[PDB]
Amino acid sequence: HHWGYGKHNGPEHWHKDFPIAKGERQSPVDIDTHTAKYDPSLKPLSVSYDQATSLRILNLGHAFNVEFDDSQDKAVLKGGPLDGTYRLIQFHFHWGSLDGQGSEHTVDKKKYAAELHLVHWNTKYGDFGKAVQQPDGLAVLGIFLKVGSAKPGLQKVVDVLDSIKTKGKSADFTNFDPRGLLPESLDYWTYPGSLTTPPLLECVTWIVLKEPISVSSEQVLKFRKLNFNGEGEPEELMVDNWRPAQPLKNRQIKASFK
Ligand SMILES: [Zn+2]
């Protein structure tokens, strides 16, 4: 028995095991485009993924991760509202059971079909485990997915999902270039947030891109065939693994564009 996205262990139940769920800087949040403030001080994002080394793709039960080698500054994120170098460690998605829902962040209450999260940690802290204990430990790039034209760079991920259908399954996933998942523009909003899953730690500096990237209905359909359960257990489709928007409270969302 543990947390999940069901009716008896869903987001509304998390606070019982993780009190920080009712914290002051929880994520996700609704981005009100007319309240976000343009900040001329914000610098352009610097994404250097040319030397990225993907290693494996694993079904964690609540989502699947595509892990990268973070033993050196191979794939890093710099600039923007960040101070220092952040290394990419893994990326994952959250999606819905229908095309009208699935994203965690919303824009003027608009929900997208899915949301991609590219997780990076601040190298000044040594390792990921130490970074999550700091207020500026992580820097997560969020990208919205809308249903429309297929995204070529995502097909490689889609085709291997059959091999990691159930919880605990993993597969080698080398030579995947994350640059194929980025939109044309890097304009973004940013705000201080948390992880969206337990342990819900408030160590994130969120960088949500304005431009969504289009994927086909066929591609998203395959995400919906994954299982929350482990092999040999009752089947429960991995869908709607998103947390609803939380109170913004004492925070301001800044935009890199006007
Ligand atoms: Zn996420």
Chain breaks in the chain following residues, C–N > 2.5 Å:
none
Take residue 19 and report the two structure tokens written for it.
């009190």
The Cα 47–Cα 244 span in angstroms is 28
| 99 phi, psi to nearest 5 deg | -65, -20
The answer to whether 141 and 213 are in contact (CB under 8 A) is: no
Total structural domains within the chain: 1
Take residue 247 and report the two structure tokens written for it.
């109170």
CA 197 from chain center: how many Å? Answer: 10
Q: Which residues, by Cβ under 5 Å, contact ligand 1, an ion?
A: 117
Task: Tell me whether residue 55 is exposed, middle or buried, using C-beta atoms within 10 angstroms of its C-beta: 0 to 12, 13 to 18, 19 or more.
Answer: middle
Q: Is 62 one of the annotated active-site residues of the chain?
A: yes
The Cα 31–Cα 157 span in angstroms is 29
**Number of other CB atoms surrounding residue 109 within 10 Å:** 9
CA 116 from chain center: how many Å? Answer: 5
Residue 196 labeled ligand binder: yes
CATH of the domain at 64: 3.10.200.10
Experimental method: X-ray
Task: Tell me whether residue 118 is exposed, middle or buried, using C-beta atoms within 10 angstroms of its C-beta: 0 to 12, 13 to 18, 19 or more.
Answer: buried
Gap from CA of 60 to ligand 1 centroid (Å): 12
DSSP H helices, the chain, are: 128-131, 155-160, 217-223
From 13, 34, 62, 105, the catalytic residue: 62
The half-sphere exposure of 128 on its side-chain side, counting CA atoms within 13 A, is: 14
The half-sphere exposure of 94 on its side-chain side, counting CA atoms within 13 A, is: 26
The Cα 122–Cα 78 span in angstroms is 10
Given resolution (angstroms): 1.7
- CA-based R_g, the chain, Å: 17
Gap from CA of 52 to ligand 1 centroid (Å): 20
Between the alpha carbon of residue 125 and those of residues 5, 145, 188, the distances in Å are 32, 32, 25
The answer to whether 170 and 58 are in contact (CB under 8 A) is: yes
The Cα 132–Cα 163 span in angstroms is 30
**Number of other CB atoms surrounding residue 23 within 10 Å:** 17
DSSP H helices, 34-105, are: none
> What is the 8-class DSSP label of residue 179?
G
Which residues, listed in sequence order, are joined to residue 86 by a DSSP beta bridge?
77, 122
Gap from CA of 43 to ligand 1 centroid (Å): 24
In three-state form (DSSP H/G/I as H, E/B as E, the rest C), the secondary structure along 149-170 is CCCHHHHHHHHHHHHHCCCCCE
Residue 92 labeled ligand binder: yes
Q: Which three-class secondary structure state does DSSP give residue 68?
A: strand
Residue 197 labeled ligand binder: yes
Name residues whose C-beta falls within 8 Å of residue 224's C-beta, 6 or more positions apart in sequence: 95, 97, 237, 238, 239
Name residues whose C-beta falls within 8 Å of residue 230's C-beta, 6 or more positions apart in sequence: 61, 166, 167, 168
| 85 phi, psi to nearest 5 deg | -110, 130
Q: Which three-class secondary structure state does DSSP give residue 14?
A: helix
Name residues whose C-beta falls within 8 Å of residue 7's C-beta, 6 or more positions apart in sequence: none
Q: Which three-class secondary structure state does DSSP give residue 178?
A: helix
Residue 106 labeled ligand binder: no
Take residue 148 and report the two structure tokens written for it.
């429309």
| 83 phi, psi to nearest 5 deg | -125, 100
CA torsion sign for 218, 219, 220, 224 is positive
Owning domain of residue 180 = 1-258
